[PDB]
Amino acid sequence: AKHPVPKKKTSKARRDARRSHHALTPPILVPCPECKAMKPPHTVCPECGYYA
């Protein structure tokens, strides 16, 4: 409010273009050796455990 304020409503085009880099990436996953299940790399995961 005080001091700086937007001079113009940003257009539909400008907004979405800014949101160009908003899209999130899918998780990275690998099948653990123990089960056929999927796990995030370098991480122990339940429903499996570890080789000590």
Binding site: A23, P26, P27, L29, M38
Partner: protein, 112 residues
């Protein structure tokens, strides 16, 4: 054919959950469950919820093969927002929209 499933009036901003939906559009039911299984956002829970129901509908209602279906399309829509008053400084006050979503997921048979 294809199987629909919609969860309306989910108390969460559309723009937010939409981020998650776009993540699994077109994906197979398998990698999908996983993508949500390990996506770090609140939207996951809701999208998973409706995604899993879509599956059930697909099989228990349309003889579709579970291990043969994907996300033919999905999308989230804005529902009526909850407006609340937020006290501000110097007595000024304003309304804040606790928005809301309508999450649709439509599955479909792989091929033939």
């Amino acid at each position: 054919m294809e199987a629909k499933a919609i969860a309306r009036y989910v108390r969460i901003s559309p723009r937010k959950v939409r981020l998650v939906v776009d993540l699994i559009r077109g994906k197979s039911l398998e990698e999908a469950r996983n993508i949500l299984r390990y996506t770090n956002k609140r939207g996951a829970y809701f999208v998973a919820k409706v995604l899993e129901s879509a599956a059930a509908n697909a099989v228990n209602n349309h003889d579709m093969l579970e291990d043969r279906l994907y996300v033919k399309a999905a999308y989230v829509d804005e529902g009526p927002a909850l407006k609340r008053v937020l006290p501000r400084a110097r007595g000024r006050a304003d309304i804040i929209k606790k928005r809301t979503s309508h999450i649709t997921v439509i599955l479909g048979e792989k091929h033939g």
